[PDB]
Amino acid sequence: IYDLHSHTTASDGCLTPEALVHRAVEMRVGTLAITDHDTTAAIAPAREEISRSGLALNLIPGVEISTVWENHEIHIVGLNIDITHPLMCEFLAQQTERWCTIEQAIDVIHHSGGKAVLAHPGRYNLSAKWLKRLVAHFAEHHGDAMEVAQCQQSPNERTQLAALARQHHLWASQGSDFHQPCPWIELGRKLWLPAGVEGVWQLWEQ
Ligand SMILES: [Mn+2]
Ligand SMILES: [Mn+2]
Ligand SMILES: [Mn+2]
């Protein structure tokens, strides 16, 4: 199971990086991305806990970047980024100082060696036509993937998003957006991709 969107006490999650990696293994998550808001501070302690505890969990370094597009707050997740790259650190420092554009987020992620993901597209409450414009804009500026699967989701939304991703030659991501234990969100829960779209992890696995 891949869960490529989660938070820790480094941003607005309630669990430490150490508690989260253990929760992921208990939930039978095989690959976990930590994607804290505008910080990578949880990655190094999470890796340390996986090693010290002998966990069989692949940690994907990630971040969730806050952007603005056409006056809408839009979140872009970077996956498999190099968290020590000076441009990434500078960019995140500018983010916590203050937003930036979608294209600017994508460029920093790519320069850091990662893949850019349009996060939770259904949450922006856009009409079908404006969601299409957002996705077309994201793809036009070299975005790589879009989150297709979430924990709380009608089957219709998931297949609509997968078709929208495929339409623009984007890969699909999946993530719980876990912040704290609660009824409606759990690490790995109900995350799978429908047929007709490939997972974003292909872009670094091969
Ligand atoms: Mn959050
Ligand atoms: Mn978000
Ligand atoms: Mn999030």
Author numbering: 9 to 106, 177 to 284
What does the paper say about this structure?
RNase AM is so far the only 5′-3′ exoribonuclease known in E. coli, the enzymatic activity of which has been shown to be essential for the processing of bacterial ribosomal RNA. RNase AM belongs to the PHP domain family of proteins which is composed of amidohydrolases/phosphoesterases and is present in some DNA polymerases. To test this, we assessed the deFADding and deNADding activities of a recently characterized 5′-3′ exoribonuclease in E. coli, RNase AM (yciV), which can hydrolyze short RNAs of up to five nucleotides with a 5′P. We were able to expand on the original observations and demonstrate that a 40 nucleotide RNA molecule can also be degraded by RNase AM and further demonstrate the exonuclease activity is processive. Intriguingly, RNase AM also demonstrated robust deFADding activity, but unlike the two eukaryotic nucleases, RNase AM did not hydrolyze NAD-capped RNA.
To gain insight into how an exoribonuclease could function as a deFADding enzyme, we attempted to determine the crystal structure of E. coli RNase AM in complex with FAD in an effort to elucidate the mechanism for RNase AM monophosphate hydrolysis and deFADding activities. However, no crystals were obtained for RNase AM alone or in the presence of FAD. No density for the RNase AM insertion domain was observed, indicating that the domain is disordered in this crystal. The final structure consists of residues 9–106 and 177–284 and is modeled with three manganese ions (Mnα, Mnβ, and Mnγ) and a sulfate molecule in the active site. The refined atomic model contained no RNA and has excellent agreement with the X-ray diffraction data and the expected bond lengths, bond angles and other geometric parameters. Mnα and Mnβ, which are proposed to coordinate the water for nucleophilic attack are coordinated by residues His13, Glu72 and Asp255, and Glu72, His83 and His198 respectively. Mnγ is coordinated by residues Asp20, His45 and His257. The sulfate molecule coordinates all three metals and forms a salt bridge with Arg201, which may stabilize the hydrolysis reaction intermediate.
